[PDB]
Design an enzyme around this catalytic site. Structure first.
Site, PDB file in Angstrom:
ATOM      1  N   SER A  30       0.830  -1.307   0.089  1.00  0.00           N
ATOM      2  CA  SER A  30      -0.095  -0.364  -0.092  1.00  0.00           C
ATOM      3  C   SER A  30       0.957   1.535   0.083  1.00  0.00           C
ATOM      4  O   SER A  30       0.549   2.247  -0.408  1.00  0.00           O
ATOM      5  CB  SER A  30      -0.972  -0.044   1.389  1.00  0.00           C
ATOM      6  OG  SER A  30      -1.693  -1.490   1.081  1.00  0.00           O
ATOM      7  N   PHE A  65     -11.342   9.690  15.379  1.00  0.00           N
ATOM      8  CA  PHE A  65     -12.527   8.891  16.000  1.00  0.00           C
ATOM      9  C   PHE A  65     -11.893   7.574  16.858  1.00  0.00           C
ATOM     10  O   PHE A  65     -13.121   7.020  17.373  1.00  0.00           O
ATOM     11  CB  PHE A  65     -13.585   8.857  14.980  1.00  0.00           C
ATOM     12  CG  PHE A  65     -13.879   9.974  14.498  1.00  0.00           C
ATOM     13  CD1 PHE A  65     -14.853  10.882  15.168  1.00  0.00           C
ATOM     14  CD2 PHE A  65     -13.917  10.530  13.034  1.00  0.00           C
ATOM     15  CE1 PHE A  65     -15.183  12.018  14.591  1.00  0.00           C
ATOM     16  CE2 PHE A  65     -14.121  11.647  12.542  1.00  0.00           C
ATOM     17  CZ  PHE A  65     -14.727  12.477  13.408  1.00  0.00           C
ATOM     18  N   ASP A 111      -9.423  -4.694   2.599  1.00  0.00           N
ATOM     19  CA  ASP A 111      -8.504  -5.744   2.437  1.00  0.00           C
ATOM     20  C   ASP A 111      -8.361  -6.367   4.210  1.00  0.00           C
ATOM     21  O   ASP A 111      -8.012  -7.740   4.262  1.00  0.00           O
ATOM     22  CB  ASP A 111      -7.303  -5.466   1.890  1.00  0.00           C
ATOM     23  CG  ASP A 111      -6.585  -6.579   1.284  1.00  0.00           C
ATOM     24  OD1 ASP A 111      -6.897  -7.839   1.643  1.00  0.00           O
ATOM     25  OD2 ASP A 111      -5.384  -6.309   0.780  1.00  0.00           O
ATOM     26  N   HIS A 133       0.092 -15.789  -5.273  1.00  0.00           N
ATOM     27  CA  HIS A 133      -0.667 -14.617  -6.024  1.00  0.00           C
ATOM     28  C   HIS A 133      -0.426 -13.228  -5.775  1.00  0.00           C
ATOM     29  O   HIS A 133       0.725 -12.817  -5.065  1.00  0.00           O
ATOM     30  CB  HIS A 133      -2.234 -15.028  -5.886  1.00  0.00           C
TER      31      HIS A 133
HETATM   32 MG   LIG Z   1      -4.666   1.944   2.731  1.00  0.00          MG
HETATM   33 MG   LIG Z   2     -14.746   6.187  18.316  1.00  0.00          MG
END
Ligand SMILES: [Mg+2]
Ligand SMILES: [Mg+2]
Ligand SMILES: [Mg+2]
Ligand SMILES: [Mg+2]
Lengths: 408, 407
Positions: free
Chosen positions: B90, B267, B314, B360
């Protein structure tokens, strides 16, 4: 080391921006229609083929473009059959060849028909784009590495409730009594096909007829029980027909002016993997494609050609599967050399998906080039392929296309 | 379905799709707004399985029912390989779709001339994101994610690091700190002005032992910094009109407040909860965060750049967690489509890499596009093309001389 410089990536992106800006839609109808079908050639197979083709030509792999990577237009295709989320080659063939989605294991029939129920065929037949191209006066051809009676090529000419009915020997007596015809019989009688190239000799000949290349093997002999020689019956339909069974015969027939229709059946069943073929006796998929294009292009009305790289999924050690996909890519490049983008719509797709240092039913890619190829966009249902081809060729149900003809 | 047994049903469905394709015209202007939706590991199989689940949730069979992304007019395939790895990560991919240059595995916002975990190789090798260039051109900028805001994908919009795991100073060797390297959390507040930052990652912003506002009794959720810095208080003091929020009630109030011009919402201590396990009163959904970001960003007359990541697709891949995250990601795309006009907004949907019956790694992924210059999204492209299409459509560097008419 060039790859470590941001300038290299920025230049590569500027090049891609320049191809996209120069891209203009071709707003005419297509004179010629070509569909290349890669059996089980989904997005992962295309990626692995790119790596292998690149490596074969002395490169690292993923950076090197295949012939298909140069196609301007791309779309995703939803492959589901009416009764199954994970489809088979028979049900999908009806969608991309006839324009209607159908049931698993049936060919050229709507989903009103039922698998293995012979009576459900009648009144439920659907007609292929190839059938409609013939009706409009175009020349038609089918090229495959499988038997010519297999599900994918059979989708262009047959109507059956059971994909396994290759010859009369495969059918139950109840189905024969009900009026059902085997796929091999349908190949010679349903419609006029100008070019038929692939495997499947044994399904055309009476029981015991020795194969011309394997006369000492009983497993390779004719299998028909109705005493019919389907090759001799197809040859007698018109003047100018020719039957070939080896490469030497194929090469002479391609340059012969008296040959206007050609049937080439190169093996008792499936053709050999390109990697195991006898280069003097067996033609490659690229060679068969060139012969079909040369013969079909003589018609001033144009042509419809179906080309199947049919053993890609069958091989999938991976080496067999990937070398078939590489030969399939070279058949696309060969056709691109023999045809003009201004009058030829070429589509590349798969029927269904296959099921480090530098599980079925998935959507597949559609690649397009030529007149009306810009209509190939977004996420489409698989049956859309047949309709874009009918529309571009101004074939039924799109005679009212309203498109200007191409030049020449 | 009996309707599906009639050839007329399929013929009509294709005639309808033909009409849509013929009516489809390219928008030949530049884009005022740029939006990139990124699905973590959302390759072709994940998109197919999401379509089936979303369909089934709404009372349908599944595969026939379109997703919000299935309505995007333009499609392309994206080749994801990193310079040094056929199967990418990533971090390396983020540099390609966010900065426009392919890079090495485990590095962010640096060219492939840099080397993983070698601090000195950063300097002179930094590459600047499209987000950074959008801010330089006067546009407002935002980052929305379900992962920590210091994760590889969102970090690609603002950071330059030879190691994706350097979330805070506690993660870094002392030799790297002495060499001038900065942790990702520090780069988030100092590299550039970011108008909207919404996601997880509270713990990387606070000094060691600072109790989390939601889990004060859990030591594992507390602040981890060793430099005594409160990065949230520093970010808030950069400008007037800044606001820090940590729950949904505070987010909704900040959204309705005209005095709020910049917003930071963190959050969770790390990743945000799977949408399926979230407390609907305390935790905002990805669609809610997207609406708040769009409303705040759209006030700028110069336009905006917004990055939205469906980052846990993912990570969940039982499959049910992965697929429900992908369904919520599709609803965030629909929400943004309602709040923006395609005549002045270029929206791109992609994945960073691929994920590794009765009705893979390193594989190419789909790119979906709508809006000005979206017709340039076609064929088979290298992943770094995404950043260049977006820079070109927005008339941002190195394409200030784009030659495009304004929207
Ligand atoms: Mg990401
Ligand atoms: Mg929270
Ligand atoms: Mg096949
Ligand atoms: Mg042979």
């Amino acid at each position: 080391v060039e790859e470590e410089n941001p300038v290299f990536w920025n230049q590569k992106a500027k090049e891609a921006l320049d191809v996209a800006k120069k891209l203009q839609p071709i707003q005419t109808s297509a004179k010629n229609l070509i569909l290349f079908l890669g059996d089980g050639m989904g997005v992962p197979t295309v990626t692995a083929t790119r790596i292998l083709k690149g490596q074969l030509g002395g490169h690292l792999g993923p950076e090197t473009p295949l012939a298909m990577d140069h196609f301007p237009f791309t779309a995703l295709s939803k492959t589901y059959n009416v009764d199954r989320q994970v489809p088979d080659s028979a049900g999908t063939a009806t969608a991309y060849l006839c324009g209607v989605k159908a049931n698993y294991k049936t060919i050229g029939v709507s989903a009103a028909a039922r698998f293995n129920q012979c009576n459900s065929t009648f009144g439920n037949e659907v007609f292929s784009v190839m059938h409609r191209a013939k009706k409009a006066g175009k020349s038609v051809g089918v090229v495959t590495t499988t038997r010519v009676q297999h599900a994918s090529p059979a989708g262009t000419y047959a109507h059956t409730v059971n994909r396994d009915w290759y010859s009369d020997a495969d059918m139950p007596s109840s189905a024969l009594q009900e009026g059902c015809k085997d796929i091999a019989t349908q190949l010679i009688s349903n419609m006029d096909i100008d070019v038929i190239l692939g495997g499947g000799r044994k399904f055309m000949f009476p029981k015991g007829t020795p194969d011309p290349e394997y006369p000492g093997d009983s497993d390779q002999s004719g299998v028909r029980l109705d005493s019919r020689n389907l090759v001799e019956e197809w040859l007698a339909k018109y003047q100018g027909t020719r039957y070939v069974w080896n490469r030497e015969q194929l090469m002479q027939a391609s340059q012969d002016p008296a040959v206007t229709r050609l049937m080439g059946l190169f093996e008792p069943t499936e053709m050999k993997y390109d990697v195991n073929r006898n280069a003097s006796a067996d033609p490659s998929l690229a060679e068969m494609t060139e012969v079909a294009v040369r013969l079909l292009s003589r018609n001033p009305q144009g042509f419809y050609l179906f080309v199947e790289g049919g053993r890609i999924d069958q091989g999938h050690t991976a080496y067999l599967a990937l070398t078939e996909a590489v030969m399939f890519d070279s058949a696309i490049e060969k056709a691109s050399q023999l045809t003009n983008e201004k009058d030829t719509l070429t589509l590349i797709t798969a029927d269904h998906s296959h099921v480090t240092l530098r599980h079925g039913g998935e959507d597949v890619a559609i690649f397009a080039r030529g007149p009306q190829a810009h209509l190939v966009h977004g996420v489409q249902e698989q049956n859309y392929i047949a309709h874009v081809m009918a529309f571009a060729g101004c074939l039924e149900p799109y005679t009212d296309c309203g498109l200007a003809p191409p030049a020449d």
